[PDB]
RNA sequence: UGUACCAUUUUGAAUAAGUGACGACUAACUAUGUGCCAGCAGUCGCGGUAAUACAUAGGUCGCAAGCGUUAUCCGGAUUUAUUGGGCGUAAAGCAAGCGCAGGCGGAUUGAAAAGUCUGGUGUUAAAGGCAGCUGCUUAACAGUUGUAUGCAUUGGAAAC
RNA sequence: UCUGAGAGUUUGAUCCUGGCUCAGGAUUAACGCUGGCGGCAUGCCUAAUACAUGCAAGUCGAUCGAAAGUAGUAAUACUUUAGAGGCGAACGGGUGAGUAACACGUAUCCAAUCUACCUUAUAAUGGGGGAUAACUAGUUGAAAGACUAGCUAAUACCGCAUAAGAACUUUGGUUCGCAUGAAUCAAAGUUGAAAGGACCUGCAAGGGUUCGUUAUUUGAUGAGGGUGCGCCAUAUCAGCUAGUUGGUGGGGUAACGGCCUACCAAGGCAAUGACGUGUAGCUAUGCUGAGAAGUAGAAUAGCCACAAUGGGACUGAGACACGGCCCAUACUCCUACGGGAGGCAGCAGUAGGGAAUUUUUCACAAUGAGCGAAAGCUUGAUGGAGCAAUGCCGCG
RNA sequence: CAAGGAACUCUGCAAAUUAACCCCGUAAGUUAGCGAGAAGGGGUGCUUAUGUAAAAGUAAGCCGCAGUGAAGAACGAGGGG
């Protein structure tokens, strides 16, 4: 029940996220298993320096993304590679 | 096949006065945290002489751990070099 | 019928395990104390975490008797141990709870607080 | 100081306990009857009750397996 | 949240300075009062009628929206000294001996490889640590990449 | 490529041994004086003391009967939810009382284990039956409720037919292992499944997507056990241990195991510190030091333990369950005197202790969780805003 | 002899409790011999079976308010002269 999801590690009035593979029952901002890549709500462009390597391994393993997590994958195009690799 | 390998320990028998037992003693040379000198220790593990191994007192015996057969017994005897006493 | 120098139990939370009667209060040569009677007592067996200390002279009212007494209808109420609870001048219990059952003779002689703090009246 | 979910859960588990206890008692009486007057016939009934309970979860699957293996050992020894 | 911020928007220096110390360690001194009295003090110590050490005042110095005092931890302290101390006269050689276990230990050869050294792999969670960079008016701060330490296993070295 | 500052003080004066004090940092800090603002962060160290009051885990009508409301002549259409059922309530949040040992850190072996939902792959999802919530009526009550008799529904429950594969054995082969021992067959015997919902098409018959279900398969996550090493003070604590040590057969546990049982024995640990006493959550880390290391385990993060005190168990993939259940103890409160109610070490706040540490706040808007197809819904986690020169930084 | 239990009296005088056997456990002090039957507790009947030379004991069952069912069997602790 690994779940690629976010983790807030910014400061007051300035969030900062990191895509990460973690279990569902682990608290947010806690212990995790593997690092994918970071995010910034105000990076203008390239807001999601993705990895494109282990992420495909964990999704193939069966990781369940989230709504905002999925969103990031689509603008780069990671959803395409995952679904076509399934096929 | 590929089978994870168990840990081994080489020791000497100190006493044997029960049914199927052998109180072996294993030594080690752990360093000292501050004065940095080797110190000889002594700890007495127990094992079972199920058979074919006997290993009476004074017999230099090698020891491999095993699933706990009982409380305080988690080791088994094996090959015996320098059979004496 | 509790009499002079009678050891009896306390049915409340106050730290007093054994209490000894000193005087059967009420008149001259009052021989016995029946249910509802007030007596002067001395704490003899107490506990460290108790409001009373060993040796204090205090006033108590009896609630149970081994001998028992007979009511007007003919019913004879009889307990298995003599018990008393420590009371204050106002007739208000010193403890915050009462253990075990109590008689109905208390109701006649006031003692409404004792009845309301009991487990069940008999 | 109380939650309807917790209250409802307590009310449901009383009924579940009744039903599961009935099922467990049948297995207990059946294995005792079997080993009483030993007979290869009974053995079958033992399998049916143990496997069914194991699927429903009422009994841990491992306990059914150990009971099954051990009861079959008695028959082979006696036959 | 009509919040940060912005503008040639009105008024206008207007709405804003305290605390410790001044004999030495320790940058900074005079007068008045008191007269072993009243008081100060982290240490040495000041006060007995000419007090730069007390009280007040003026001056001056150290700090600053903070300044002093108190409490606790570390350093300085080589003042429990493995690194890194001593035992004649300053603290410290038992009154002396026989001595098991422990520690140490002559020379040469062979083997093994437990110490010892080295290569490969795994791991030592993330934050923090140090270096670089970015973003907040720069900073504090946040993010970013880099950055060891030990353990286990395996392959070699053979001087002690 | 690391990298270290001293001074005062015994004497009439000097040298040395030697103790005391100071110059530097630092804190969950407090007190006195004073006091303008902004950006970050911190904020009961004590009484794991007791708590007023209000909030802190629910969700699905696309599982099911019924009821209610609004429109409609009617058939019916829409909305709402007390109850049955599924799922989640074991996550998340708080505190550090207990605990000196496999608790924890590290490395490991689980030929001695579990894992619901999730991943891959593979067979089925046919047909019956008996019940009870809601409702009605009666008794008992102010009400909470409780008891009694009838009425219904299903993805609730219980049989039956059926096994691609499963589980337990039997027959001999295979490949063997680290001692118990695993690994693979071919044949056979024995045993064992469930449930439908939404929508589309089709005159119909039938067909179809999707959710969901049973039986398996792959992994992964999470949980559990054992072991080596490391991990406080004290000898002005020297013996301790009788399920303690071992074997046998049996029972139990997810599993090995004196975990339990009956028998047979007398061992095990201990001066290389047992046992006892006192103390303490451990670790990554914080402060300090040139370094070796000393010191505290703020905040936060990993692991353990706890939920007024002490025990037991149900349900479940997972609890012996903070705001579930049962019992006892202590404490408080309500009553119409028969009976009951309660657990702020969840967010605030109150009383008390203290030298001393804050809103009885707003919103799920972002992140996160639980249920749902969505609409959504619930989130004192979380995100903000108050408060305080509490610390760093900046400007007047 | 119901309730109380030394309130009686110069004084627990007298009376009352315990009492046999078997199985647990037993302190301060000491001249190391004792204290000590210390203190404090438990079981006892009948039947069946197993145990033995006989037992004692062990397991199951039965009855009564009570089972050395009656007789005979030590009350104890602490301080002082
Ligand atoms: Mg053995
Ligand atoms: Mg179960
Ligand atoms: Mg002064
Ligand atoms: Mg002056
Ligand atoms: Mg020092
Ligand atoms: Mg030092
Ligand atoms: Mg010296
Ligand atoms: Mg000398
Ligand atoms: Mg000499
Ligand atoms: Mg001498
Ligand atoms: Mg000599
Ligand atoms: Mg020697
Ligand atoms: Mg790290
Ligand atoms: Mg940072
Ligand atoms: Mg001098
Ligand atoms: Mg200083
Ligand atoms: Mg509803
Ligand atoms: Mg709960
Ligand atoms: Mg919890
Ligand atoms: Mg929190
Ligand atoms: Mg706390
Ligand atoms: Mg589930
Ligand atoms: Mg049906
Ligand atoms: Mg069938
Ligand atoms: Mg079903
Ligand atoms: Mg055994
Ligand atoms: Mg503690
Ligand atoms: Mg130093
Ligand atoms: Mg902390
Ligand atoms: Mg804390
Ligand atoms: Mg609560
Ligand atoms: Mg609170
Ligand atoms: Mg509490
Ligand atoms: Mg939300
Ligand atoms: Mg500040
Ligand atoms: Mg500043
Ligand atoms: Mg009498
Ligand atoms: Mg009497
Ligand atoms: Mg008298
Ligand atoms: Mg008299
Ligand atoms: Mg006499
Ligand atoms: Mg005596
Ligand atoms: Mg005398």
From Swiss-Prot, chain B:
GO cellular component, one term: cytosolic small ribosomal subunit
UniProt record similarity statement: Belongs to the universal ribosomal protein uS17 family.
Gene Ontology BP annotations: translation
Organism from which the protein derives: Mycoplasma pneumoniae (strain ATCC 29342 / M129 / Subtype 1)
UniProt xrefs under NCBIfam families: PRK05610.1, uS17_bact
Function of the protein: One of the primary rRNA binding proteins, it binds specifically to the 5'-end of 16S ribosomal RNA.
A GO MF term: rRNA binding
Keyword Ribonucleoprotein assigned: yes
UniProt keyword list: Ribonucleoprotein, Ribosomal protein, RNA-binding, rRNA-binding
Protein name per UniProt: Small ribosomal subunit protein uS17
Classification via InterPro entries: NA-bd_OB-fold (IPR012340), Ribosomal_uS17 (IPR000266), Ribosomal_uS17_bact/chlr (IPR019984), Ribosomal_uS17_CS (IPR019979)
UniProt cross-references to SUPFAM superfamilies, sorted A to Z: Nucleic acid-binding proteins (SSF50249)
Pfam families assigned to the protein according to its UniProt record, in alphabetical order: Ribosomal_S17
UniProt KW Cytoplasm keyword: no
Quaternary organization: Part of the 30S ribosomal subunit.
Curated annotation (Swiss-Prot), chain C:
GO MF terms, alphabetically ordered: large ribosomal subunit rRNA binding; structural constituent of ribosome
Keyword Transmembrane: no
Role: Binds to 23S rRNA. Forms part of two intersubunit bridges in the 70S ribosome.
SUPFAM superfamilies, alphabetized: Ribosomal protein L14 (SSF50193)
Coiled coil: none
Family matches, as Pfam families: Ribosomal_L14
Keyword terms: Ribonucleoprotein, Ribosomal protein, RNA-binding, rRNA-binding
Gene symbol of the encoding locus: rplN
Oligomeric form and interacting partners: Part of the 50S ribosomal subunit. Forms a cluster with proteins L3 and L19. In the 70S ribosome, L14 and L19 interact and together make contacts with the 16S rRNA in bridges B5 and B8.
An example Gene Ontology biological process: translation
Annotated source species: Mycoplasma pneumoniae (strain ATCC 29342 / M129 / Subtype 1)
InterPro entries: Ribosomal_uL14 (IPR000218), Ribosomal_uL14_bac-type (IPR005745), Ribosomal_uL14_CS (IPR019972), Ribosomal_uL14_sf (IPR036853)
PANTHER family named among the record's database cross-references: 50S/60S RIBOSOMAL PROTEIN L14/L23 (PTHR11761), LARGE RIBOSOMAL SUBUNIT PROTEIN UL14M (PTHR11761:SF3)
GO-annotated cellular components: cytosolic large ribosomal subunit
Family, as annotated: Belongs to the universal ribosomal protein uL14 family.
Name the record gives this protein: Large ribosomal subunit protein uL14
Curated annotation (Swiss-Prot), chain D:
Pfam families attached to this UniProt entry: Ribosomal_S20p
Record key words, sorted: Ribonucleoprotein, Ribosomal protein, RNA-binding, rRNA-binding
One example of a Gene Ontology biological process annotation: translation
Molecular function GO labels: rRNA binding; structural constituent of ribosome
Coiled-coil segments on the chain, per record: none
UniProt keyword Ribonucleoprotein present: yes
A GO term from the CC aspect: ribonucleoprotein complex
Biological function: Binds directly to 16S ribosomal RNA.
HAMAP family reported for this sequence: Ribosomal_bS20
Family statement: Belongs to the bacterial ribosomal protein bS20 family.
NCBIfam families, per database record: S20
Entry protein name: Small ribosomal subunit protein bS20
Source lineage: Bacteria, Bacillati, Mycoplasmatota, Mycoplasmoidales, Mycoplasmoidaceae
């Amino acid at each position: 029940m690994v779940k690629i999801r976010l983790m807030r590690m910014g400061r007051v009035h300035y969030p900062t996220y990191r895509i990460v593979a973690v279990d569902s029952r682990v608290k947010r901002d806690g212990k995790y298993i593997a690092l994918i890549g970071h995010l910034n709500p105000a990076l203008k462009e390239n807001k999601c320096k993705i990895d494109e390597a282990v992420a495909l391994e964990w999704l193939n393993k069966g990781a369940k993304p989230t709504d905002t997590v999925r969103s990031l994958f689509s603008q780069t195009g990671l959803w395409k590679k995952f679904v076509e690799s399934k096929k | 096949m590929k089978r994870n390998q168990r840990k081994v320990l080489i020791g000497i028998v100190k006493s044997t006065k029960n049914a199927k037992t052998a109180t072996v003693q294993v030594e080690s040379r752990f360093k000292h945290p501050l004065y940095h000198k080797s110190v000889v220790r002594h700890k007495k593990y127990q094992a079972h002489n199920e058979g074919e191994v006997l290993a009476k007192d004074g017999d230099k015996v090698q020891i491999v751990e095993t699933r706990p057969l009982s409380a305080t017994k988690r080791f088994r005897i094996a090959k015996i070099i320098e059979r004496a006493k | 019928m509790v009499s002079f120098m009678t050891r009896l139990n306390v049915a409340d939370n106050t730290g007093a395990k054994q209490v000894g009667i000193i005087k059967v209060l009420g008149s001259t040569r009052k021989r016995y104390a029946f249910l509802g009677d007030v007596v002067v007592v001395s704490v003899k067996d107490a506990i460290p975490s108790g409001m009373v200390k060993k040796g204090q002279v205090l006033r108590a009212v009896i609630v149970r008797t081994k001998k028992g007494q007979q009511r007007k209808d003919g019913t004879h109420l009889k307990f298995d141990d003599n018990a008393c609870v420590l009371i204050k001048e106002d007739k208000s219990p010193r403890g915050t709870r009462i253990f075990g059952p109590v008689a109905r003779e208390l109701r006649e002689r006031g003692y409404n607080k004792i009845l309301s703090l009991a487990v069940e009246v008999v | 100081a109380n939650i309807k979910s917790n209250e409802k859960r307590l009310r449901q588990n009383i009924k579940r306990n009744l039903n599961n206890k009935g099922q467990k008692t049948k297995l207990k009486t059946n294995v005792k009857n079997f080993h009483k007057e030993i007979n290869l016939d009974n053995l079958g009934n033992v399998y049916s009750q143990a496997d069914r309970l194991a699927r429903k979860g009422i009994i841990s699957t491992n306990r059914a397996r150990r009971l099954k293996s051990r009861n079959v050992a008695v028959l082979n020894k006696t036959q």
